[model samples]
Target: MLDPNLLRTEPDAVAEKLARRGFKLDVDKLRALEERRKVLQVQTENLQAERNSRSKSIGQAKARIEPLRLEVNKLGEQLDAAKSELETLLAEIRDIALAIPNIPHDDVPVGRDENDNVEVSRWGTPRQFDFEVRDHVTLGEMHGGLDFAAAVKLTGSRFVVMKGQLARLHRALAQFMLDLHTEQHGYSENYVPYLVNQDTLYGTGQLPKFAGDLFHTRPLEEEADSSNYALIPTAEVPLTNLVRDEIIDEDDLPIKMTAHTPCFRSEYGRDTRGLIRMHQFDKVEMVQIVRPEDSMAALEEMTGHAEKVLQLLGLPYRKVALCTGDMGFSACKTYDLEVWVPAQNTYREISSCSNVWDFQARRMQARCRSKSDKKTRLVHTLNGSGLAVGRTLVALMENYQQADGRIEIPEVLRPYMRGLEYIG
Candidate 1:
């Protein structure tokens, strides 16, 4: 969430910046709300002061003491009413504030959508295919490795069952990604809960706004003491929430963590035929908590870390800088890594790296204190799909498919697959 102080001080300026992303802030409505808040606060304070003076005077001075006591009692009631109204108004204002997305950094390219996003760089060239190119779905079906019919019988559409070698290949992709992030890159591997409370989702900017995109659960029993929980849409939510309400030392400025987990999303729209859009999918997520000064550099480094996964796997890909209107809810700036999908004959997003720049930390009360100054400030947060496991598997299947209908394993993943050269 944006700083309320910034919103209160320069609402028009904030609104102007938000316009780049097509978000219109009702400056007039917000100002009126703030004005009302100010008036009620002042009114309550004056009432308290007057009642205190009257109550104090009653102790020392006069037969008017009884009437003054009566007057103070009336003032107390009025004060209580004013306080209740003020609290309710504040809650309303807070809800509006919470819904507003983060302002894009100045360096972010100004554009209306993904079509206007700028390509930063490209990696390897797309491989030339002499034969008809097969999409991941076709490749998976060729060998009965991907069982969509079974998945449909078990659950419904947009679910898949990977059998035999294909299942192991998917597992290998996840393991390779986790190892790359944890061993080569400076990130601590974590095991986070797949289900988290509403507060956890709120801290990551997923709740109270994008709740429809999440799968939430009701308490099993109405009388139970359990809090409302939601299945994690990404490991980013749980891993980033680790620092919620924490105060860290300045020396621990940059904390990097990675987790490979199955993400659950209620969202349904595109690519329902294959693993491209699934209710459940695995992702190796990377998150970093750093000082504000280091976040931009961390964003670049983290993006490169994700890029390295493709580089090592020899997958051709490109990195695009997301324009203002294309960024995520909590991202100030973002870079999306699109891997070459031969079947689509175009690049598709396999990873997205972003710098949130204290937007989430403020919401989570995640702060770092410098010993020299004894002052604390919000820490900036960054998260990325080191690589979405399913998408990586898709890219691998399409790009490494041979004319004979066998999928050639990338040399990097060969060890993870027990030195198997190909999957037929």
Candidate 2:
């Protein structure tokens, strides 16, 4: 959510910025609402003042107390009615405010869709294969390592069941990522619940809208609170919300945390095959809470932390700055790391890093207090996939596949794999 003051004071400027990303603001409706709110506020104040004055005058005119008391009573009723009306109008305005997306940072490129996204730079080169390149699906099944049919018989499509070393490889990837983030990146490791309530989702800017993209559960018991329970779509939801309703000292400006968890999404179609897109996938996520002035620089450093993972694994990838239209709902700015997949002859997104810049802090009521001035302010929040474990596995399979039908383990992951060099 944006600062309500800013929206109220500069609707046109806010709307102009929103328009760059194709979001239209209903300025007329907002202005009318504000006008009515002002009128109601003054009316309520006047009624209160009149009621107070009349009540005091009753003592001076006890003989005429009935009429004075009656006038006071009427004024009290009018004040109550005015206050109630004002409350209702405020709720309506809040609902409108909550639905609006964050204004993009000026640094963000203005464009439509991924086609307009600008590539910042490239890392390692995409290797050439003398033999025909095999996709993850083909290579995964060559040794019965990946089983899609089993997953179908057990559940449905857009899922996978890895057997033997391939399954271990997936686990190893997640473990390696968690260790790297917690040990070297100065992030504290965390374990969070996969099931969350509606307000929890709202704190992370996932509720009231985008509900269609999430998997929700019915009440577990009859006569239970049936509002809703949702499966997490990303660890970002839980990790970032840890600071909700909290006010930390300025000394703890940047609070970094990492978690390895499974993400559940209700998205359908698009990348329907293999591990590229799945209903359930494992991910190692990094989240940071920082002072407003430090968030932009943190975004770049946090992005590099994700890039370090790919670079260590020796997987070729590129970083792209997402255009305004392509950025996520809560993000003011975002950077996407796309890893090279040899089979598809292209790069696929393995991580997305973003600086939301207090957009979520306003919703969560997360704040910080500076000791010098004793001033309180909203904290900026950021989250990124240190790397999606499933896609990293997919990239490894395609990028490190040998012509002899075996996958070579990346040197960094070999220790976690018990010194195993290859998986067939």
Candidate 3:
């Protein structure tokens, strides 16, 4: 969400900037709504003042007290009606305001889509294969290593089953990433419920817009007789919501947390052939809450933390600075980490690190309070997929695969797999 103050003070400038991200703010409609609200507020205030004066006069100087008292009651009824109308108008304005995307950071590249994204740098090297490279599905399903058929029988399409060494390798990928984020990087480990409510999604800017892309639920537990339910699309939803509506002491300016969880998404019109796209996938997510002054630095650091996972695993990858139109709704700026997949012969996004820059904090009313001044301010929010576990597994399978069809597990994950050198 953008600052209402910014909209009120500089609608032209704000609308111009939003155009770069392709959000056309109806300056006319918004201004009209705002002006109406202001008028109503002033009318209510003036009426209150007159009634206050009249009531005070009745106490000391009037034989017209009875009539004045009746007049005050009439004024009270009018005030109530004005207040009700005021509430309705504000709600309508707020709905329009909440749908607006966060303004892109000044430094973000101006483009319409992923094609215009700027590549920051490349890491490691995409392995040159002497033999024709087989995709993960071919390599894994060669010997019943992966089972799409069984998964279909269990839970319809867009789901899969990993078996034998392949299943173990997938588990190893998640554990390795979680340890990397929590132990190497300073992030508190958190395990949250897979289900959240409507408020949680709204705070993260997922509801009311991207609702079709989510998998929500109905009341399940004994605690409910109503239809209040939602399934988390990503760990970012729960981890970031920890600070929702909270006021932290300034000393806790930078709060870093990590979680390994199963993300569920109802991806519409996506390739559902392999683990590249799944209904449920594991991800190690990192989120940070920091003061406004520190968010930019924290964004870079958080992005680096995600890149570290690929570097440690010896996987070839590249970092791309996302253009304005490609950014998420809640993010002011985003950096996508695309890991090299040999079969695709190009990089695919395995991680995305973004600095929301108080966008989400403001939506959730998450704040940090300075003890010296005893004043609270919205803290900046940042989240990154330290690495999408399923994609990391895909990268490993495609990059480290032998001509013989066996997959060599990355050295970093060997300990998690109990000193196993190869996955197959």
Candidate 4:
């Protein structure tokens, strides 16, 4: 953020940072509002001093209390105007500052968008093919498990309905990931609400920006005129909001949690084909709350846990550092794990791990206390797709296809799949 202090002390510097990301700020308008706020602040302080003095005089002249009460009421009336003006000016200043995106971390590569993102490294090898590659759509037709037409009849669009072995494989992928993270990676399994409110969305930086992409629900318990709830686009919203308004003990520095939940997105105007993009999909998500100093280490570790999924499945994938413009609203830095899709013949995003710094914590008031100083400060928040289960299903169906149209389930997934080695 270009904080109040930074916006007050060095607005030009803040303007320049926004400019780098193709954002412009109205420095003159902001400065004028701040100047008015300063004057109102002084006005309120002087009125408060006068009010205090009048109350003291009343106590000294106790017999004259009634007359002094009149004087105090008049001072309160006078103070209200200044206070009202001060609130307006402060809010105006804050609105402008809050709309500005977080400044990209220095370590992040400066660029316009995904085109400028750098591929850090790749893992595994794409299996060699002996037959013409069939995309997920063609392969799904072999078994009739990926029933898009049926899903269209059940739901409007951008949704998939899997059946038989394919559905089991999808379920298996989610279970394998939950166990991996909960057992080996040490993330606590959490069951979170699928419906969240705007306050929860705001805590995760999704409200103002991505509200249009959400499926909002009208709770029956609320008055018809009141605010509506939105189906969670990701488990991150509910999982992260657990710590909202909480001042955690320093001993609980790193709070790691995992949840496998279905996410919804409108994704209007995007291509709706196969499983690349969907209105509803399942994801096993990982979230961490940590002291400011430990978040970066936590980001890399979280990313490796995502990469571990691909490694065990023997799926070829690459790790890329998202550029400034491509980074999410709340992230300081992000790493995307793109798994190789043999049909697409390219790596497609399967997971994303981000260090959100204190961007979210500041919004949620999720802070921790220092043991020695007894001072509190915002904690850092991080989240990653342990894996987007649908996309993983897409990658696996394409990568593990056999010449005879049977799909080989990865060795690691066999245990979860009732010891079945393949699905057709």
Candidate 5:
């Protein structure tokens, strides 16, 4: 959601920014609708005023034995017609407003797509390997860790079963990420429901837009009922919704939270690859509720926090600033962490950190009070994948493969693996 004022006062300016991202907002249509609404509203108000005046005159004339009842009835009929026209025009304006995307931040680069994204920084170096490396799907099967065949039997394509050491390693990665964020990065660890309501999805800018990308569910025994639910696509939905429809004090200006959860996505019409794409995957997510003044800086800090995980794991990665057209619907700006995959011979996105900048707050009615004055204001929200466990495993397996079938664990993960250094 953008500032409603912008929509009314400077839709053209906002539309120009949207153009940089290849989205052409219907500015002309919106302007026309607004103009018509103004006319309808004025007409409705004038008719109501005239009807009230005429009714009062009719009452006085009846008391004084004067003629006015017929004129009053005519005025009432005109008022009703004007009211109906006003209602229709207002509804049309509302629908158009709901479909508009958030405006990009001034700092965001103007571009047409991901190809124009700018690389901001890089971390670590891809390790040198003496032998040819195998892709994650091959290495994972060789180690008896990933069982896609069984997954297919259970849930069909875009699914996998992790067993033995691989499963434990996957769990360990999540634990390590949560611990790092809460213990070292000033984030509070939280546990959230994996299933959320439709309203919660809309508050996070996932619904009414990207519904095809989510997996919806129904109640177990109450399937006969009309009620519905959905598996969360990310912990961001619940964690950020903590203050939905609520107001907070300025003292809590920055609320930092972290959660580890299994995210479910439909991934409809998209490529289905090893770990790069999955219907279900585990992720450790970080979200922050902060004052508007601090959101941009917080976005940068949050991106670095996600990058820190790869640094500790000794993974080679780069950070790219998403171009205007490449940013998410709710995000004013976004930074993506792309991890190097030796087997793929390129980098793939493992995490995206974004500053939603009150786009979600206004929709959720989540706000914060200012300390200087007793005024309430929408708080800026930020969320990032602290790291995706599945992709991390893929990177580790491909980058750390040995001449034999064994894969060496990064030194930082040894403690989590009981001092063990290799997974064969």
Candidate 6:
């Protein structure tokens, strides 16, 4: 949610920022609603005041044996009408406020689409292969690891089944990421529900918009009581909602958490290409609840933490700053870490770190008490795909492939793979 003051005082400015992100804010309509609300509120207050005064006078007249009931009744009728008008106006204003989007930060690059995004930095280097590299789908099939045909037969498109070495490697990648974040990055490991309620979805800005991208579940046996549940699109939904509707002490300025979970998506109109776009995948997500002032720094730190994973695995990657239009609906700013995939000859997004900057906290009612003034304020929320397990598996397979069709395990992951160095 944006500052209510901005919506009332400078709606045009808010509209302009929204326009850059391909959202159209109905500023004129909102302004008109606001104007009507103000007028009706004043009228309601005056009517109540007048009624109170007249009723008191009627009491005085009755004490003096004089009739003043007609005047009091007229004022009562007027007050009733005024209150009804006020209620209607209040509803209109509330609806307008709820529809507004978060304002972009001053430093965010303004643009109309993803093409305007700027590259912040690059890491490592893309490896040179002596032979033509095969994409993950082809390589995994040839190695008898990825079984897409069987998967399609069982669950339709946008789904896949991994067998043998590839399945083990996929599981190992998630476990390795979870361990790395918990042991080295100071993030608390958590196990959360794969299915969440509507409230949880709303807290993460996934509901009331972007609903098409989600996989909603059928109601439980007791359908009357289970309409609220939906399959989670990412671990982010549950990890970030841990603090929803709660207030933390100042001492807990930054709450860092991580979770390894399976994510389900609808992928309504997307192209299902290998592991890149899938209906279900495993991910190790990182989430942080920090003081407002520390969110930007936290974003940089988290992005680096993700980049560290790719670096440790000896993968080439780059970090790109998302322009205003490219940033997610709830993020004030975002940085995506794209890892080089030799097969595609392009850097694909392996992780995305965003500084939601209280946009989510406001919806979640997550707050912190400030030490300085003892006042409660919304905390900033940040989350990232520490790294998508499937994509990482794809990157490893393509980049570490040998001429013999075996995959070399990155040294960091060898320990998790029981000291095994290659998957044939």
lDDT of 5 by residue, 167-283 (tens): 988888898999999999999999899988878988888877788898887666755464477889999999999989988887977999999999998755554558788989999
Q: What is the lDDT of every predicted structure here?
A: 0.92, 0.91, 0.88, 0.88, 0.87, 0.86
Model 6 steric clash pairs: none
lDDT of 2 at 125: 92
In angstroms, the error of model 1 at 274 is: 1.0
Stretches > 4 Å off in candidate 3: 42-84, 220-227, 268-270
Q: How would you encode candidate 4's per-residue C-alpha lDDT over 61-122 as one tens digit per residue?
A: 98546787898999989888878878888877777766677767778888887999999999
lDDT of 2 by residue, 217-240 (tens): 888777388557899999999888
TM-scores, one per candidate: 0.93, 0.91, 0.91, 0.90, 0.88, 0.87
The CA lDDT at 2 in model 1 is: 95
In terms of lDDT, the poorest run of 10 residues in model 1 is 59-68
| lDDT string, candidate 1, 264-330, tens digits | 9877356767888888999999999998899999999999999999999999999999999999889
Candidate 5 ranges beyond 4 A from true positions: 39-91, 219-226, 268-271
lDDT of 3 by residue, 226-324 (tens): 557677888999989999989999897689999999899886566557889898898999999998899999999999999999999999899999998
Model 6 regions lying over 4 Å from their true place: 38-96, 268-271, 371-374
**Model 1 residue pairs with clashes:** none
RMSD of each: 2.9, 3.2, 3.2, 2.7, 3.9, 4.1
Deviation in Å, model 3, residue 271 alpha carbon: 2.5
The candidate scoring highest on TM-score is: 1
lDDT of 6 by residue, 296-380 (tens): 9999899888988899889999889888888888888889999999987899889989898988898889999956765799999
